[PDB]
Amino acid sequence: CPRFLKVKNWETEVVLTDTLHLKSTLETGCTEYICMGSIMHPSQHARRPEDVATKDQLFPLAKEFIDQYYSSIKRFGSKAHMERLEEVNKEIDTTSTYQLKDTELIYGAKHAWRNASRCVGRIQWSKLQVFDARDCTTAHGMFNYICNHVKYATNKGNLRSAITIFPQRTDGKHDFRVWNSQLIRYAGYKQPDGSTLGDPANVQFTEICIQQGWKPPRGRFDVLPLLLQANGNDPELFQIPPELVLEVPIRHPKFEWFKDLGLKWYGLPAVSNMLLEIGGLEFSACPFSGWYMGTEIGVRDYCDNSRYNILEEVAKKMNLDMRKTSSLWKDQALVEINIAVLYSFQSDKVTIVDHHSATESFIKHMENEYRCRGGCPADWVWIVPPMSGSITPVFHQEMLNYRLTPSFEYQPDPWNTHVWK
Amino acid sequence: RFLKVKNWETEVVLTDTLHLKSTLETGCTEYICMGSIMHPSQHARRPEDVATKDQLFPLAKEFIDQYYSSIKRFGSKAHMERLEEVNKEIDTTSTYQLKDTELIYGAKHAWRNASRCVGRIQWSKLQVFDARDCTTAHGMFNYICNHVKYATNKGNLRSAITIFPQRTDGKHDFRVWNSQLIRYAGYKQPDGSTLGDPANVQFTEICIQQGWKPPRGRFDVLPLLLQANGNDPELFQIPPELVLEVPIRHPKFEWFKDLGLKWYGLPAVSNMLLEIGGLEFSACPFSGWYMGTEIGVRDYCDNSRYNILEEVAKKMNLDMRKTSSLWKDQALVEINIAVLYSFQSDKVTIVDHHSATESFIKHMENEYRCRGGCPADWVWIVPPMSGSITPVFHQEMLNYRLTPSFEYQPDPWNTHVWK
Numbered sequence: 001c002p003r004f005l006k007v008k009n010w011e012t013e014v015v016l017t018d019t020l021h022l023k024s025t026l027e028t029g030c031t032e033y034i035c036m037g038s039i040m041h042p043s044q045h046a047r048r049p050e051d052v053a054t055k056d057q058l059f060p061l062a063k064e065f066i067d068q069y070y071s072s073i074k075r076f077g078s079k080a081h082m083e084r085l086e087e088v089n090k091e092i093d094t095t096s097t098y099q100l101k102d103t104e105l106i107y108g109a110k111h112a113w114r115n116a117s118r119c120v121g122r123i124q125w126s127k128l129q130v131f132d133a134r135d136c137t138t139a140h141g142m143f144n145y146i147c148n149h150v151k152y153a154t155n156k157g158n159l160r161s162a163i164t165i166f167p168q169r170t171d172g173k174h175d176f177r178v179w180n181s182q183l184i185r186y187a188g189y190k191q192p193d194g195s196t197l198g199d200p201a202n203v204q205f206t207e208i209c210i211q212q213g214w215k216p217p218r219g220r221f222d223v224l225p226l227l228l229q230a231n232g233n234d235p236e237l238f239q240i241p242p243e244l245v246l247e248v249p250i251r252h253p254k255f256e257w258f259k260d261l262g263l264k265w266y267g268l269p270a271v272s273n274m275l276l277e278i279g280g281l282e283f284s285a286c287p288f289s290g291w292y293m294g295t296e297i298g299v300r301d302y303c304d305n306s307r308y309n310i311l312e313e314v315a316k317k318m319n320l321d322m323r324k325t326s327s328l329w330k331d332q333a334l335v336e337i338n339i340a341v342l343y344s345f346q347s348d349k350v351t352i353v354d355h356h357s358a359t360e361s362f363i364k365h366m367e368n369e370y371r372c373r374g375g376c377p378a379d380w381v382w383i384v385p386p387m388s389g390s391i392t393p394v395f396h397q398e399m400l401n402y403r404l405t406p407s408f409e410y411q412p413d414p415w416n417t418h419v420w421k
Numbered sequence: 422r423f424l425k426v427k428n429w430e431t432e433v434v435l436t437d438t439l440h441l442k443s444t445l446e447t448g449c450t451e452y453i454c455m456g457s458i459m460h461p462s463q464h465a466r467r468p469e470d471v472a473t474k475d476q477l478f479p480l481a482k483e484f485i486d487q488y489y490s491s492i493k494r495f496g497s498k499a500h501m502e503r504l505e506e507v508n509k510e511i512d513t514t515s516t517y518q519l520k521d522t523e524l525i526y527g528a529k530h531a532w533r534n535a536s537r538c539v540g541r542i543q544w545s546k547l548q549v550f551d552a553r554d555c556t557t558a559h560g561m562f563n564y565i566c567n568h569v570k571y572a573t574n575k576g577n578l579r580s581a582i583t584i585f586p587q588r589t590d591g592k593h594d595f596r597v598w599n600s601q602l603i604r605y606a607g608y609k610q611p612d613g614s615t616l617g618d619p620a621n622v623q624f625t626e627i628c629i630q631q632g633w634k635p636p637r638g639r640f641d642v643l644p645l646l647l648q649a650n651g652n653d654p655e656l657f658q659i660p661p662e663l664v665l666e667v668p669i670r671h672p673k674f675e676w677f678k679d680l681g682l683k684w685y686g687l688p689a690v691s692n693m694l695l696e697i698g699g700l701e702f703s704a705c706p707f708s709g710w711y712m713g714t715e716i717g718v719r720d721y722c723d724n725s726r727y728n729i730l731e732e733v734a735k736k737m738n739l740d741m742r743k744t745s746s747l748w749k750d751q752a753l754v755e756i757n758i759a760v761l762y763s764f765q766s767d768k769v770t771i772v773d774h775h776s777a778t779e780s781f782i783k784h785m786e787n788e789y790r791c792r793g794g795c796p797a798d799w800v801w802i803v804p805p806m807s808g809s810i811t812p813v814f815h816q817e818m819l820n821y822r823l824t825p826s827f828e829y830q831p832d833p834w835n836t837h838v839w840k
């Protein structure tokens with residue numbers, strides 16, 4: 001690979017020079033003859049519960065991370081650096097794994113976020129509260145840690161980014177897993193007539209919860225129970241205390257009828273099914289939370305045809321001409337729904353960011369990373385917002401996408417792999 | 422290996438085998454993705470990279486083979502004779518000439534293979550004008566006038582391409598210096614701002630230096646600047662009756678007409694390079710019709726173009742003090758309603774981004790069934806507004822390079838030695 005790669009911003013003519021791509025250690029999925037940039041889950045962005053490192057695989061992955069850590073604290077080559085290398089190597093030799101120091105765990109989690117090429121929110125990466133839950137042994141203990149996380153991160157609406165890290169993978173038969181895809185999500189219920197009540201995206205998981213014993217209220221916005229797996233055991237159900245679940249009723253500054261739609265959303269997005277990889281170690285349960293960009297709710301959750309799918313009903317109440325696509329009735333209603341989401345979160349003093357502010361901040365972050373770090377991996381397909389793409393600055397920004405470690409990765413859904421006791 | 426692409430809205434999975442036929446590079450590697458880079462080295466053609474006899478026969482052979490495979494006569498007597506005829510011609514002249522059937526097939530397939538074009542459901546309906554006998558800029562003017570008249574068709578636009586003589590030694594290139602046949606001038610003002618289209622300031626300055634008398638307005642149609650056989654380019658005025666324009670008005674906002682906006686009906690790209698069988702056609706203006714967002718989102722609302730969001734939101738009496746009011750997004754939709762309404766009212770062909778992306782999904786389905794795949798660049802296919810409420814946003818695409826193809830080339834004023 002060439003030593004310097006340039007990216008151009010076609011609106012400002014700013015040219016940035018990337019050298020950090022030379023440190024890439026993981027594959028993207030593309031080849032020299034095909035680009036897979038729009039594939040959602042290439043196998044290179046995933047981790048199966050089985051590519052558990054052997055001793056020999058683990059040694060160089062650990063050294064690479066330890067070297068990167070001691071380089072960051074300006075102690076590369078120090079006595080402490082060499083002693084830590086030797087301690088880790090002895091641990092891998094005698095136990096086939098090793099334990100991160102608290103300092104290294106925090107560094108690793110922050111950098112997995114810093115390295116997440118699909119995240120537009122990374123200007124915040126160094127402000128992450130890391131909760132060490134590696135002493136957890138039971139699903140009840142996981143519930144405790146998760147409740148404390150939710151309460152801390154919610155902070156009565158002044159949201160604070162946080163991650164809780166449960167024990168790392170050992171032999172693959174003792175995994176900790178949060179079976180939920182997010183800590184807070186709404187149930188979906190398939191009806192005998194083919195319609196769906198609630199959130200269609202969560203129908204499969206809802207059915208699992210019901211099979212495990214959950215009694216469903218069968219409403220439109222039912223918060224799902226936690227389904228928590230500790231030490232490879234069968235998962236167990238817990239209800240999050242409702243006072244810990246902050247929600248926002250959606251209303252519109254101009255349209256008084258918008259509140260009659262009965263819409264609401266939860267304030268805290270907390271992804272709970274990804275895998276955190278640090279120095280070859282695999283943290284299969286690592287729920288992390290930030291705050292929302294408004295389009296996540298107003299465009300995707302509400303307006304995707306496969307989700308709540310509200311464009312028609314909103315357009316009807318707006319008295320729009322819906323008989324031709326070229327009236328752009330869908331586009332008009334989409335904007336008004338996203339106005340409503342931002343207005344409702346701001347009115348209730350729940351942290352949220354609009355897509356103009358978020359992408360403008362991301363450009364500033366990217367430029368700083370190029371200047372201070374030598375680059376910033378970014379996935380244009382994910383960074384550009386799902387509405388009004390070209391009136392945001394990231395649309396015009398060339399980006400380079402590549403995979404650095406530590407990293408967040410996808411992993412198979414646990415019900416597809418779990419061996420029931 | 423076979424590669425699968427999934428639509429995450431409809432769960433339709435398609436299986437791509439056509440990518441196995443590409444030999445050109447993408448710019449990506451196993452360790453870096455360049456999918457959002459606008460002009461990687463792999464989508465451009467420099468004049469110095471002229472082909473030699475040695476490079477040209479395998480490229481010619483590949484193209485003849487796929488042509489005769491396409492008419493289901495691979496290995497036939499005609500196929501054998503054509504390969505021998507082409508071989509002798511490269512040998513004795515360092516190049517070869519396409520048959521008329523091959524030129525048409527090659528131009529249609531360059532369009533079919535254009536991974537960034539959402540309009541490709543139309544690919545087999547393309548009028549091909551053979552201009553390979555042209556020798557002078559006056560001849561180029563005539564061919565281009567005939568193209569504009571044919572394609573405009575009084576508003577019932579018809580896709581067309583005019584193909585001028587191929588590159589020989591690189592010192593005798595035919596070039597249209599305009600980026601599109603019809604574009605509006607842009608002028609740097611004393612106070613540092615730009616009048617007209619900022620995208621065309623440099624080309625406008627060259628026309629002025631060459632003697633064009635500028636009206637210094639907001640929507641002045643530029644003259645044609647035409648280069649034949651490597652000679653200095655010459656200026657020509659397209660006859661105004663041939664230039665179809667649309668004044669922009671809004672169906673509800675009667676004040677919108679007072680913005681004084683207009684656009685032209687015929688998008689006609691004239692600075693790309695057509696590559697067929699190793700031959701390079703450096704002047705190949707091609708035209709279709711607009712998707713509304715090209716004008717309403719990019720031309721009018723890019724900060725670096727006409728940049729009208731603030732004026733429109735002013736007339737809409739929107740609160741512009743905070744971005745979270747989405748005042749830009751509101752004005753953006755109303756501008757794009759006006760563009761579509763105005764073309765439709767004047768019976769000028771245009772497609773909205775909902776209809777266009779819907780047609781592209783159907784096109785992909787067609788191509789996967791009959792051809793084994795469809796190269797597509799998500800970054801370009803997804804429209805610049807309302808992305809995820811169009812079906813292509815949810816469609817995984819594979820991007821790969823097939824030939825014949827359209828490629829970028831350097832602007833002629835960076836290469837040209839003036840005699």
Ligand code: HEM
Pocket residue numbers: 109113116117118119120121122124128161162163288289290291292293296353358382408
């Ligand atoms: C602080 C405020 C944050 C904002 C506004 C934000 C914004 C976003 C958005 C809008 C997406 C795309 C989500 C989608 O389309 O489904 C995303 C993706 C992502 N975020 Fe952030 N985020 C924030 C914090 C965080 C934190 C704290 C972490 C982890 C510690 C994180 C890790 C990620 C990852 C890994 C992805 C992409 C997942 C993938 O690779 O597919 N984000 N973010």
Ligand code: HEM
Pocket residue numbers: 528532535536537538539540541543547580581582707708709710711712715772777801827
């Ligand atoms: C007939 C109706 C057509 C429609 C609606 C259409 C639509 C579009 C649009 C919206 C773009 C993106 C333009 C931009 O963002 O600047 C595009 C790109 C493109 N179009 Fe089509 N197009 C049509 C016909 C054609 C024809 C007839 C040709 C050539 C014979 C063609 C060749 C191309 C190419 C090569 C590109 C991509 C340029 C690149 O590779 O960077 N299109 N098209």
Ligand SMILES: N=C(Nc1ccc2c(ccn2C2CCNCC2)c1)c1cccs1
Pocket residue numbers: 121181269270271288289290291292293296
């Ligand atoms: N603002 C956010 N939103 C968001 C929502 C869902 C997300 C992500 C990253 C992955 N996911 C899921 C993964 C499964 N597929 C759907 C997307 C980010 C954040 C969540 C956590 C910190 S910030």
Ligand SMILES: N=C(Nc1ccc2c(ccn2C2CCNCC2)c1)c1cccs1
Pocket residue numbers: 540600688689690707708709710711712715
């Ligand atoms: N509907 C169209 N629109 C359009 C506009 C500009 C285009 C293209 C393809 C390349 N260009 C230019 C190339 C220089 N860089 C800016 C884009 C297509 C069409 C033009 C011709 C047939 S259809």
Ligand SMILES: C[C@H](O)[C@H](O)[C@H]1CNc2nc(N)[nH]c(=O)c2N1
Pocket residue numbers: 037038039040381382383429814815816817818
């Ligand atoms: C097929 C395509 O990759 C897919 O729809 C992607 C597009 N970009 C995205 N971008 C974000 N931020 N989130 C998404 O879920 C998607 N989906």
Ligand SMILES: C[C@H](O)[C@H](O)[C@H]1CNc2nc(N)[nH]c(=O)c2N1
Pocket residue numbers: 010395396397398399457458459800801802
């Ligand atoms: C940096 C990025 O590639 C650039 O802004 C692209 C994005 N997608 C695009 N898509 C289309 N159709 N046309 C464009 O000019 C662009 N520009």
Ligand SMILES: [Zn+2]
Pocket residue numbers: 030034035036037449453454455456
């Ligand atoms: Zn790629």
